[PDB]
Amino acid sequence: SCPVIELTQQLIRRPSLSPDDAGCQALLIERLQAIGFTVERMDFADTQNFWAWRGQGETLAFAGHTDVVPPGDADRWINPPFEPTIRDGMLFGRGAADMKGSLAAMVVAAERFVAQHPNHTGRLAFLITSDEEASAHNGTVKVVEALMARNERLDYCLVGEPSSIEVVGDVVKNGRRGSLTCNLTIHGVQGHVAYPHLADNPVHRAAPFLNELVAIEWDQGNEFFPATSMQIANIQAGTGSNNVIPGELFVQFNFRFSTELTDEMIKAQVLALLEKHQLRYTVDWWLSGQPFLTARGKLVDAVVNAVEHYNEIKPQLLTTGGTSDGRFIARMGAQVVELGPVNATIHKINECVNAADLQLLARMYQRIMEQLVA
Amino acid sequence: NAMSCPVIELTQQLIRRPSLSPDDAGCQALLIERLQAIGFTVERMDFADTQNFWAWRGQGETLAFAGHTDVVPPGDADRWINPPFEPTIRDGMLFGRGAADMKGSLAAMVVAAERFVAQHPNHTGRLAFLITSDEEASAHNGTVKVVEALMARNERLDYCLVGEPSSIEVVGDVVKNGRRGSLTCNLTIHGVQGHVAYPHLADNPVHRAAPFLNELVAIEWDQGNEFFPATSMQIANIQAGTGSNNVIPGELFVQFNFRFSTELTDEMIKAQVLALLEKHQLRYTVDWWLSGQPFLTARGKLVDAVVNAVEHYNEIKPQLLTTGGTSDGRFIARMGAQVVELGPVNATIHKINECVNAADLQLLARMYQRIMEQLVA
Ligand SMILES: [Cl-]
Ligand SMILES: [Cl-]
Ligand SMILES: [Cl-]
Ligand SMILES: [Cl-]
Ligand SMILES: [Cl-]
Ligand SMILES: [Cl-]
Ligand SMILES: [Cl-]
Ligand SMILES: [Cl-]
Ligand SMILES: [Cl-]
Ligand SMILES: [Cl-]
Ligand SMILES: [Cl-]
Ligand SMILES: [Cl-]
Ligand SMILES: [Cl-]
Ligand SMILES: [Cl-]
Ligand SMILES: [Cl-]
Ligand code: NA
Ligand code: NA
Ligand code: NA
Ligand SMILES: [Zn+2]
Ligand SMILES: [Zn+2]
What we know:
The structure is a homodimer. Chain A is an alpha+beta fold.
């Protein structure tokens, strides 16, 4: 009997391409209801979510997503992406690593924990979405809005996103950068190269602004974050003709920003720089996430202790990579840490996860439950 | 009135031929029959899809008239008052594709030749025509290939009048005595593509290029001269990225064009750009293309004859300018010829309801004839 592997395989075969749950939450809700959880479904548009809880008081929530990213050309995978296969101790399939293995490990951890501590003094909760990977307008963000609107208690959140580099627990994420995109259009006057005095080239007018923008140091980072990083992802002007002076320049730049900056600080600094260079512009901002950091506390201690119990060495506490639905849950004032399997193969062809690592992760999750909720 | 209006008659005949570049649509056969009838020798020079001819009468000091039989597409036939290939006279104006650019000029210069030869049958100079069926499109197989053939055999060509429509309001108010060169740089700045989450593994070529672009757009190239404005540099195109806000691009494309005066060589422009690229320690690939060299006829017998002919018939001296419209002048300038452009009002060229003033065509033919008499009688 391998309940963690068996449940992971059941999840992988369900092709839950965001935002379609494809029956994953029906499986998890059955398991949680069987050990005494109250489940509230919170479905918005085409996204399925649930908030499940057992007990009262000091609250530890496990967070995760049932959705997976598309497999790409399925016929190029060694085994079909939705046909989980074990070979040489690796479980292959879309979502094996991101993050159906983690979902299975946290459900089985809860079953083993509730068996050991049927009258645990704390509250154990799950916050599960069918859209973390795509637009995510209708997933965890909407559950958190609902929970904050009813003054829900949530002290600690373990996000099961695959945090690990080479072995489970080598790395845990104790924070994530914000992401803010500036979609900037510099307006000029379109014309012809034969008569430049009748045109105003926005590429020429923008050049001093772009030179200053790429030289700015936005912050110096802190103990847990590197310096805020600004990158020009896209730039475009012209019709493809060598005799047209373009009328518009489009520049898109992204900020992956530390807790040293807010989106409003970055926006004000950018608008000030546009004003200093006297540009005519239209701007559209995208805020895809706010930074969060859990520097210390009972949750960090519990995660470090659970990992150390098996690995001896403490996990590195990092803020690397993208973000997670932790960014939403952090709005509740919760401590938020991410612990999950090796992330090397996420979003790639032949995604897989070490089966022994999933079993170990389930034991680490159970130890976190025991420390915080028993 | 065809028996007393030979310029208008030959213009309307040409307009009827849908000579969309590069199809002559039979226009050159009409010009060749008229020149052969007055003792020209004609040498057709056809290259692939394009028809050209070199025609001459007499010997020695040579004045060539240059022009093209091709016209640009009419566009939306519904927006035309009369069909674009159905020449119509309304209010002293001849309407039709090519009326202004440049079938009126072609008619004027052929009739001027007929009158000139009638007046000076044993003229002491050589009068020539260099006609192409592709000035307006690629022009790979037009005037450029004729000039290559003439230069290969050391053909004499002292003076060239290009009949491109030069005028603003009244025929002869402007003559073009030069044109700017055109030089384009297709620049790639090389970087290393990556992901915004891991910027130290990438090298954003937009960021590396920003100081270079800032300096490039601030350079002053020349201050032009009596006949040219300052050399003009414009960035026509710039592109980088995949369209995703999470990708650091690996390559930046920049295209910039120079419209340069006779005061600067293409060599000097390229050197300054390479010096700036090297100063900025960039990884790059450049692809240069020279569309044309500048040319200038500041003074001499041709400028005098054109100015004298226009003044004789208008009593106002043409402005001598170097911008606006296009011509094959730059190719003929390679032969060391004096090159000037005189033609009708250019307001309606490449537009719906293109037209030319009928009386202005008659006057242009007389100006052309006076230029022939001054230089090759
Ligand atoms: Cl198992
Ligand atoms: Cl949805
Ligand atoms: Cl336990
Ligand atoms: Cl208990
Ligand atoms: Cl444009
Ligand atoms: Cl957020
Ligand atoms: Cl006439
Ligand atoms: Cl012949
Ligand atoms: Cl005469
Ligand atoms: Cl004679
Ligand atoms: Cl970084
Ligand atoms: Cl970079
Ligand atoms: Cl790229
Ligand atoms: Cl040239
Ligand atoms: Cl001279
Ligand atoms: Na309790
Ligand atoms: Na002679
Ligand atoms: Na000047
Ligand atoms: Zn995930
Ligand atoms: Zn023309």
